[PDB]
Every structure is written in C-alpha cells, then in structure tokens.
RNA sequence: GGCCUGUGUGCAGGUGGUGCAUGGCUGUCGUCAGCUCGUGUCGUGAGAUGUUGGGUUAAGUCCCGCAACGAGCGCAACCCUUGU
C-alpha cells in the first residue's frame, strides 16, 4: 500500500545518502554495489516499513500521546515555527540541553520559576 | 524571726595542672577569589562533570558554543563618614 505516486514524487531529487569516507554498518541486506563510489535509496524497505509504521503508529496515535516540536537548524527555524504556529503546539528553538528528560523533576522547578 | 556569738556537721574557696579534654572569644593564610550542594550522565570504584574552551573582569562579575541543567555561602549593593 503506497501513499502517493512516483513521478510527482521524482520531481526534486531522490538518491541522497552522504560522503564515502564514513560508512559503518554490516548490512549486506541494505548495501548494493559500486558505481561512482556512492549509493541509491532503498525500494523494498521504503514500501514495507511505510505500511508497518502506518498500522502500528496509528494504533498508538489512537492510544494518545504528545510530542514537543523542538526545532534547531538555521535552515528551518522559521519554517518549523510557521507550521508550529499553524498547528498551535509548543516548540523550542536553539539547543538540546544535557540531562533534562531523565532529571525532569527539577525542570519541574524551572517551570515553577518560569 | 532580721541579726549576728560560737560547735561541728554539708563545707566554702584556688592566679594548682591538662588551651593536645571542651565551649566561648580572637589572629592568621586572606578582604585572596573562590569553596560546596541538589538531582542527574560517566566510572567496578576512589572520583569526574558542571567550575573545561574563547572574549572579558578589581573577582567563579558577565557574554558566547558544549552532560549538564540550577542554586547557595562569597564579590557587587541597601549601613556610617566625607564630596554638591
């Protein structure tokens, strides 16, 4: 089950993946072969985990949680802020701090101070 | 009974020792800019991190990027005198 289709997907560049001096997995199941020393995006895994992410993440999205829009890159500060102003959800701008998400009971106190 | 005369009984007192038994008080490094805690992450552990690195300061005073986020006791300042 696809989402929307190939040519009006293919418009703006589909072949990404980085530099060559850095790859480290082991995964022959996602590694293909050399031409001009660089790879192409993965067909079967795109489709299959598109479907699986769809079904289970809909189940949990019905189970009902929420996520901050923490957006940081200078490429997308205003873009993310615009969509976040549209969707109305809270957001953050600049930096991921070391050690909040575990030590939450004192950013609780930063909230009281806020 | 106030009171003081004695008798002795409880005694009362020490500038006699331990300041290395103690408290209190005080000088000193030093009015030098630092010294710690929370909760966390790291480390088997002693411990580290924060408090490293630049600009910057009378100074851990301040800014910027980061396993740190935060804070206190400090340095500043409301005190006195002088200066209009």
From Swiss-Prot:
Highest taxon listed in the record's lineage: Bacteria
Family statement: Belongs to the universal ribosomal protein uS2 family.
Protein name, per record: Small ribosomal subunit protein uS2
Chain's gene name: rpsB
Residues of the full protein shown: 1 to 114 of 277
């Amino acid at each position: 089950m696809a989402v929307v289709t190939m040519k009006q997907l293919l418009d703006s560049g589909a072949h990404f993946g980085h530099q060559t001096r850095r790859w480290n997995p082991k995964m022959k199941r996602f590694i293909f072969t050399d031409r001009n020393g660089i790879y192409i995006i993965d067909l079967q895994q795109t489709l299959t985990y598109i479907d699986k992410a769809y079904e289970f993440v809909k189940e949990t999205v019905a189970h009902g949680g929420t996520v901050l829009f923490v957006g940081t890159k200078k490429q997308a500060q205003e873009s993310i802020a615009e969509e976040a102003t549209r969707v109305g959800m809270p957001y953050v701008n600049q930096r991921w701090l070391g050690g909040m998400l575990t030590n939450f009971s004192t950013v609780h106190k930063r909230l009281q101070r806020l």
